[PDB]
Curated annotation (Swiss-Prot):
Summary of subunit composition and partner proteins: The complex is composed of two ATP-binding proteins (MalK), two transmembrane proteins (MalG and MalF) and a solute-binding protein (MalE).
GO terms for biological process, alphabetical: maltodextrin transmembrane transport; maltose transport
Gene source species: Escherichia coli O157:H7
Localization terms from the record: Periplasm
PROSITE patterns linked to this entry: SBP_BACTERIAL_1 (PS01037)
Name of the protein this chain belongs to: Maltose/maltodextrin-binding periplasmic protein
Length: 366
């Protein structure tokens, strides 16, 4: 069982666990209660195991898309923020931590894809997808290319597919309708066709993955890529003069990336639920608490309005949140997994020519 009278917190080592431990110190220095921050390997797989026997940490930090499965198993306590605290965070971030109508975690950080561009090769990046073919022809006359990004994973291609009407599961009145999938409607077909035409006209290559795209942009071979906040650390080393901006529009509508929310959940077996609430609301989710974690390792964009307004002085972070609000929350329901594999195969088959766009998307509907 979980020990009463202390807080044990699990958070991945790629986040500011040392900064989180300093927040624990301010807590441990005006409450008396000790906070121990641990970063065990594969914590997202260990947590459901230990929490099923009534053990594990008091608080777990992870991407919200895994918290739906935790909540399905009753591993997470229903949190009780009052309306005043809820208004301190962006409303769409609360959508990411709701399961079966219950809030089951506190939103912390916000992740979304943006357009990354080389200011030297391209000082004013394009605003729409439609102008990218001609811009590629201009750059190819100089021996550069316009755009390279990961075509193997649908996380990277979905923003264009979703723009004109494609969607995963219909989201209304706070619930996903698993009987309503929108991968082969007219809008999804239109965006995927534009993608395939880019490959047929040799503006992109179907075999490009994460590594080929990153290496090409970091060496100045291509003018743009598409990636998230975790990729910036590599571009900084390349000394490529780069910027981050809003994704291009398609048919006048914004590209719609899926939004990931780093969230903090309270173990349902914890005897320290009131201590955890005090720590998360009044120490971590403050300007001073988020600053302590951010100075350790950058969080990207954040769900707390007051601190996001300061972080957005960085145009890369402002662009991240702008794309996040133009996108959609990643569904946390279990059917989401069958969606991703289906769309992954459809995009791969349409890009290579194994299937037409219509046939690939139809097979993805079922
Ligand atoms: Zn992150």
């Amino acid at each position: 069982k979980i020990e009463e009278g202390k807080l044990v917190i699990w958070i991945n080592g790629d986040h500011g666990y040392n900064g989180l431990a300093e927040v624990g110190k301010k807590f441990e220095k005006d409450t008396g209660i000790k906070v121990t921050v641990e970063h065990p390997d594969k914590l997202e797989e260990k947590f459901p195991q230990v929490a099923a026997t009534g053990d594990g940490p008091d608080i777990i930090f992870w991407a919200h898309d895994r918290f739906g499965g935790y909540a399905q198993s009753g591993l997470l306590a229903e949190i009780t923020p009052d309306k005043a605290f809820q208004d301190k965070l962006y409303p769409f971030t609360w959508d990411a931590v709701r399961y079966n109508g219950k809030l089951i975690a506190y939103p912390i950080a916000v992740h979304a894809l943006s357009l990354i561009y080389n200011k030297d090769l391209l000082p004013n990046p394009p605003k729409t997808w439609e102008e990218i073919p001609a811009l590629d022809k201009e750059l190819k006359a100089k021996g550069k290319s316009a755009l390279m990004f990961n075509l193997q994973e649908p996380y990277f291609t979905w923003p264009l597919i979703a723009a004109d009407g494609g969607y995963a599961f219909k989201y209304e009145n706070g619930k996903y309708d698993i009987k309503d999938v929108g991968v082969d409607n007219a809008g999804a077909k239109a965006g995927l066709t534009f993608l395939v035409d880019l490959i047929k006209n040799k503006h992109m290559n179907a075999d490009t993955d994460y590594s080929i795209a990153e290496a090409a942009f970091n060496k100045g071979e291509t003018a743009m890529t598409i990636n998230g906040p975790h990729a910036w650390s590599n571009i900084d080393t390349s000394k490529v003069n780069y910027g981050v901006t809003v994704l291009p529009t398609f048919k006048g509508q914004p590209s719609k990336p899926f939004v990931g929310v780093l969230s903090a959940g309270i173990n349902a077996a914890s005897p320290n639920k009131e201590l955890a609430k005090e720590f998360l609301e009044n120490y971590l989710l403050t300007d001073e608490g988020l600053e302590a974690v951010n100075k350790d390792k950058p969080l990207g964009a954040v769900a707390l309005k007051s601190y996001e307004e300061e972080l957005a002085k960085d145009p890369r972070i402002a662009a991240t949140m702008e794309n996040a609000q133009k996108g959609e929350i990643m569904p946390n329901i279990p059917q989401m997994s069958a969606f991703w594999y289906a769309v992954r195969t459809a995009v791969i088959n349409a890009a290579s020519g194994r299937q037409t766009v219509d046939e690939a998307l139809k097979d993805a509907q079922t």
